[PDB]
Structures are given as structure tokens and as C-alpha cells.
């Protein structure tokens, strides 16, 4: 019987964040504190007998500032299956090259419509959306959309996508969307996973985009490269990134962008910029502290427009720490600490602290 069917292949989870977060100005006029604590309650059903499978998620937020971040919020989303490929409709929150849902702060950022998942066929997977709104990861109400940087409004987003396996080690990807009165955007990748004894990926990715509708007339072009070296217990990675045209990367004001030197604070997807980025990473279990983690990384810009002259430049530091207890009763028990610096001539500068405690627990 299906409604039973939904509850017996059901599963059921809640999270714990508390949150800290710091922004110090060198303009100190503007520096913002932050203690919160977050509740986020996920559910997904099983689905109903037959050829269509129907099932229903919904996710809980609850958030509230210790002293926005400040309400509750209960997201449902309908679901359809057929074979492996998945349909849902309402509260959606998943990541793509066009179009990517934050959580980065106490309560993760959703989207509203429909999104469209293809089970992987002859090694293709294809993806499709239509949104209508954006609930930043900070506020409960969903609003229309408008562009980071760039301004605009519009009440709906689309994509569609293929991500294609060439080889088993190399995929290809075409991604075309479009922010309704506002800009098109096309994105093709392709990333190569070399495994030896051991790794190297190298990831590859150029976007343009120009102005939809009757919005003013936009022009941009991103190219992005990262190579990511796994040795052992260590990873570097070195990217390049340059973005062109008369235009900033254009995206979704709220969401992530999809940029191989996007980081902590900056995306580094201002007009005409040219970036490098050197990153570290070190897991501390080969050495015997499971749980332990520690990232670190520089990003470095310049050629940036002011006016008619491309002598902006920037740099940003990022270094993460991190503790996941791994026995006794405090178990899965995670703490976090991200901590930025960033430097320019064409903004300000800033040091940002983000403190997260984040506890996971399977209710069944
Ligand atoms: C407050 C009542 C708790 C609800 C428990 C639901 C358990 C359903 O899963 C059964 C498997
Ligand atoms: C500055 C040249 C831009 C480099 C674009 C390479 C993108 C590779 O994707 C190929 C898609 O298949
Ligand atoms: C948490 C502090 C992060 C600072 C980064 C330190 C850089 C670590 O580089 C060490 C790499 O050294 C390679 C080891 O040299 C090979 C010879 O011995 C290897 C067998 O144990
Ligand atoms: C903000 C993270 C601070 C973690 C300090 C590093 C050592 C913690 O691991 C202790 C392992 O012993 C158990
Ligand atoms: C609508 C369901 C929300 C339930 C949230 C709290 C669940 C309480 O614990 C249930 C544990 O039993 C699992 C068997």
C-alpha cells in the first residue's frame, strides 16, 4: 500500500550547527558579529509501488541569532521516479555549473521549481530545472531572482545539461541556461581523473554569457583551470582563472558560482581579472588523528577594470582547521574553523573568522 510504502523506506535525519562568524574591516564602520544556532530537520520517503514511484522530502530550518538568521522553515518537495531518473518539485537544493545552492552559512540557501535528474544511460547524465525563486541562505522567504554584481530582476531560471563520459577516466560537460530578462550563459568542462599508485585531476572550464531579454547589453567570458595533485595524506592544487568581456561572471546573487578560484570570500570574477590560486590540504589519519583536517590557500588577482584602467588586483588567504570527534559518546561531532584575509585596491579589505560546531544525527 503506498502511503505505508512512503513511511517503511523512509529515512530521517537532524543536524545541530551552532555558528560563529566575525567580519573585521581595515572602515571598521562596517563590521558585522555573529552567534547562532541552527536545527535542520531532513526527511525523505520511500516511493509508492509501480512503473512511477511518488514520493515527498521535506526539510526543517529553524535558526536563531545567540548574541538575519532569525525563523523557521519547512520546504516540501513532491517526487517522481521512474527506472533510476528522479523528478522533484518544490524546495530543491543541489549543485550544478550554472546554477548551485549555498550552505556555507547556519541554514543552507533553497530554491524553488523543478529539477529534473537523468540516470546515467550509455555513461550520459542529463539535468534540467525550472526555478522561480531563491530563498537566501539567511532569510525564510523565497524572492525572484536578480544577478550578482550586475543587478536585474527576473522570475525564472532554466538549464539543461550533459555530463558525459568519454573514457572512464574523462568527462565532458555542456550546460546551457538562462536567467529570464537578464543574461544566457553556456558552460562546457571537461575533467580528467588520472589514478596511479596517487592522483591528478585536471578540471577545465569555460562559460560565456550575454544579456536576455531587454536587459542592458552584457558580454563575458570565464575560462578556469585546476590541476588537484593527491600524494599520500597530501593534495596541492594550482588554478588559473580569467574572466573577459565588458561584464563580471554572472550568477544567481545569493548562490555560488561555478569558478575554479571561487573561495571563502571572493570569487575573483571581476571584470577583466586574471587569478592564480596555490592550495594545500593535509588528512591527518595516516599519522594517527583521524578527524583532524587542515586546509590552506592564496589566491592571487590582478588586470582588474577601474574605469578605463585594468590596475586592480587582489589577494586572499583562507585557512581551514578541522576536528570530527571520532568515538565515544560526543561521536560525528564536528568542529570547523575557517578563517580569511583579503587584500585590494578596488574594495575593501577584510578579515573574516567562521567558527562552526555541527553535530549529525540519523533519526532512522
Ligand atoms: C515523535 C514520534 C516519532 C516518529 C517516529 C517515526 C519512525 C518511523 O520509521 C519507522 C521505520
Ligand atoms: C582561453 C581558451 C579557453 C579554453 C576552453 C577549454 C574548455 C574545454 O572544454 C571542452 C568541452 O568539451
Ligand atoms: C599543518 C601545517 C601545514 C604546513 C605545511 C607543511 C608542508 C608539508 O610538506 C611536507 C612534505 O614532505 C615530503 C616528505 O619528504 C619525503 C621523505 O620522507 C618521506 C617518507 O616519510
Ligand atoms: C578547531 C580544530 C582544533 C583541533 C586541534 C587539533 C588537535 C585535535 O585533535 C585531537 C585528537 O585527539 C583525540
Ligand atoms: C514527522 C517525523 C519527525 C520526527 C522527528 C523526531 C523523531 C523522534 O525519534 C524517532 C526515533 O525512532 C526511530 C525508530
Same mark, same amino acid.
Do not use: C, M
Given at each position: 500500500h503506498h502511503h505505508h510504502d512512503l513511511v517503511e523506506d523512509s529515512h530521517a535525519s537532524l543536524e545541530l550547527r551552532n555558528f560563529?562568524?566575525?567580519?573585521?574591516?581595515?572602515?571598521?564602520?562596517?563590521?558585522? *558579529?555573529?552567534?547562532?544556532?541552527?536545527?535542520?530537520?531532513?526527511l525523505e520517503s520511500g516511493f509508492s509501488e509501480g512503473t512511477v514511484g511518488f514520493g515527498v522530502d521535506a526539510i526543517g530550518l529553524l535558526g536563531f541569532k545567540l548574541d538575519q538568521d532569525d525563523y523557521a522553515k519547512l520546504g516540501l /518537495?513532491?517526487?517522481?521516479?521512474? %527506472?533510476? %531518473?528522479?523528478?522533484?518539485?518544490?524546495?530543491?537544493?543541489?549543485? %550544478?555549473?550554472?546554477?548551485?545552492?549555498? *550552505? /556555507?552559512?547556519?541554514?543552507?540557501?533553497?530554491?524553488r521549481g523543478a529539477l529534473l535528474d537523468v540516470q546515467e544511460i550509455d555513461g550520459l547524465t542529463l539535468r534540467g530545472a525550472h526555478l522561480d525563486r531563491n530563498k537566501l541562505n539567511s532569510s525564510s522567504d523565497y524572492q525572484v531572482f536578480s544577478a550578482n554584481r550586475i543587478g536585474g530582476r527576473?522570475?525564472?531560471?532554466?538549464?539543461?545539461?550533459?555530463?558525459?563520459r568519454l573514457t572512464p577516466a574523462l568527462t565532458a560537460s555542456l550546460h546551457q541556461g538562462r536567467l529570464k530578462d537578464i543574461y544566457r550563459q553556456t558552460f562546457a568542462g571537461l575533467?580528467? /581523473?588520472?589514478?596511479?599508485?596517487?592522483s591528478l585531476k585536471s578540471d577545465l572550464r569555460f562559460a560565456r554569457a550575454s544579456e536576455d531579454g531587454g536587459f542592458r547589453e552584457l558580454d563575458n567570458r570565464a575560462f578556469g583551470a585546476l590541476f588537484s595533485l593527491?600524494?599520500?595524506?597530501?593534495?596541492?592544487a594550482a588554478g588559473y582563472q580569467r574572466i573577459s568581456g565588458d561584464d563580471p561572471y554572472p550568477y544567481?546573487?545569493?548562490? *555560488?558560482?561555478?569558478?575554479?578560484?571561487?573561495?571563502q570570500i571572493g570569487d575573483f570574477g571581476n571584470v577583466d581579472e586574471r587569478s592564480w590560486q596555490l592550495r594545500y590540504d593535509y588528512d591527518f589519519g595516516a599519522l594517527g588523528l583521524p578527524g583532524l583536517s587542515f586546509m590552506s590557500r592564496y589566491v592571487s588577482g590582478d588586470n582588474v577594470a577601474r574605469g578605463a584602467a585594468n590596475d586592480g588586483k587582489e589577494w586572499e588567504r583562507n /585557512?581551514?582547521?578541522?576536528?570530527?570527534?571520532? %568515538?565515544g559518546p560526543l561521536k560525528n561531532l564536528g568542529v570547523k574553523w575557517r578563517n580569511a584575509t583579503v587584500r585590494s585596491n578596488f574594495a575593501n579589505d577584510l578579515d573574516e573568522?567562521?567558527?562552526?560546531?555541527?553535530?549529525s544525527l540519523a533519526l532512522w
Open positions: 560563529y562568524f566575525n567580519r573585521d574591516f581595515r572602515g571598521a564602520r562596517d563590521n558585522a *558579529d555573529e552567534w547562532a544556532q541552527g536545527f535542520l530537520l531532513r /518537495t513532491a517526487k517522481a521516479r521512474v %527506472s533510476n %531518473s528522479l523528478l522533484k518539485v518544490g524546495a530543491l537544493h543541489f549543485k %550544478s555549473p550554472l546554477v548551485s545552492a549555498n *550552505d /556555507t552559512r547556519l541554514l543552507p540557501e533553497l530554491f527576473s522570475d525564472a531560471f532554466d538549464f539543461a545539461g550533459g555530463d558525459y575533467v580528467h /581523473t588520472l589514478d596511479l599508485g596517487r593527491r600524494l599520500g595524506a597530501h593534495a596541492v544567481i546573487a545569493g548562490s *555560488d558560482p561555478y569558478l575554479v578560484n571561487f573561495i /585557512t581551514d582547521l578541522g576536528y570530527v570527534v571520532q %568515538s573568522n567562521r567558527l562552526i560546531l555541527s553535530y
